[PDB]
């Protein structure tokens, strides 16, 4: 099946095509395609915004990060693991339509790989920046990777998910992806409307 499937450089394989029969070989070694070795080295080198429902908390936290920064303990007791696993047990079976929990679970896994990587670009204050450098320096004494799950609170969740939509628009994709994105942030605000203690 198909039109291009060969372990070596492709020659419209559906054996070395375009050559005589006395060149075949069926040895078993490593196989790499590499797009015909970059086409024989280029022919031998040429010969949108969130709804206004709970808008007060972000305005309150905008002034709060000027001198208090909403956190004073480096080993903060409030983490994201249990409050994250909560949605797979309460609102995935109640609020969303009955069916598959992909739209919540896969997005949560994406939020893991976004939270483990997003540090360094964007959601940072100056004092937060020196705190991040001091955390990196004190975490480099045992050459271990820096896990931002156990040393960061969950109160920044709404600000990263509200600065997310204007950086979706930086690249080009379809519009129903943005529809589903704003729908899941709307569901997040729907949940966090009641639970204000977290």
């Amino acid at each position: 099946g198909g039109r291009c499937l060969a372990f070596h450089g492709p020659l419209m394989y559906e054996h070395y095509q375009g050559w005589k029969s006395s060149w075949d070989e069926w040895v078993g070694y490593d196989r790499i395609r590499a797009y015909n070795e970059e086409n024989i080295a280029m022919k031998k080198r040429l010969a949108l915004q969130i709804p206004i429902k709970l808008k007060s908390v972000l305005v309150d936290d905008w002034e709060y990060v000027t001198k208090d920064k909403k956190i004073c303990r480096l080993p903060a007791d409030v983490t994201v693991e249990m409050v994250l696993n909560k949605y797979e047990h309460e609102v995935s079976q109640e609020l969303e339509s009955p069916g598959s929990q992909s739209q919540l679970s896969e997005y949560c896994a994406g939020l893991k790989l976004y939270f483990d990587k997003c540090l360094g670009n964007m959601l940072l204050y100056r004092l937060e920046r020196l705190q991040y450098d001091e955390l990196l320096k004190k975490s480099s004494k045992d050459q271990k990777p820096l896990v931002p799950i156990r040393i960061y609170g969950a109160i920044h969740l709404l600000r990263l998910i509200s600065v997310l939509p204007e950086l979706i628009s930086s690249t080009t994709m379809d519009l129903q992806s943005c529809q589903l994105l704003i729908k899941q942030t709307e569901d997040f605000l729907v949940w966090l409307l009641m639970h204000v203690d977290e």
Binding site: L58, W62, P98, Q101, Y107, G110, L124, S162, T171, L180
Partner: protein
């Protein structure tokens, strides 16, 4: 990171060829946002501001994930027939 990005890709290599066209085969649980992860070094960091308006093991992974999803679907079906 901007200097690294250009010196790595933007200078003379793979200008027309898409780099992020083959990262799907090794990355899992990445479906909603995929294009924005590639150009994370193309923009310089800036201070905080606010506007005045405001595949072998991956197949096994998704198979066990879908098995867990099916079991959870059975469990919420049981819950809905209990509550109905």
């Amino acid at each position: 990171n901007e200097c690294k990005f250009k010196i790595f890709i933007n200078n003379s290599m793979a200008t027309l060829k898409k780099i992020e066209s083959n990262f799907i085969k090794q990355n899992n649980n990445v479906k909603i946002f995929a294009k924005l992860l590639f150009n994370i070094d193309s923009h310089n960091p800036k201070q905080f501001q606010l506007p005045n308006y405001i595949t072998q093991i991956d197949e096994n992974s998704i198979k066990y994930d879908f098995f867990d999803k099916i079991y959870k679907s059975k469990m919420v079906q049981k819950r809905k027939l209990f509550q109905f």
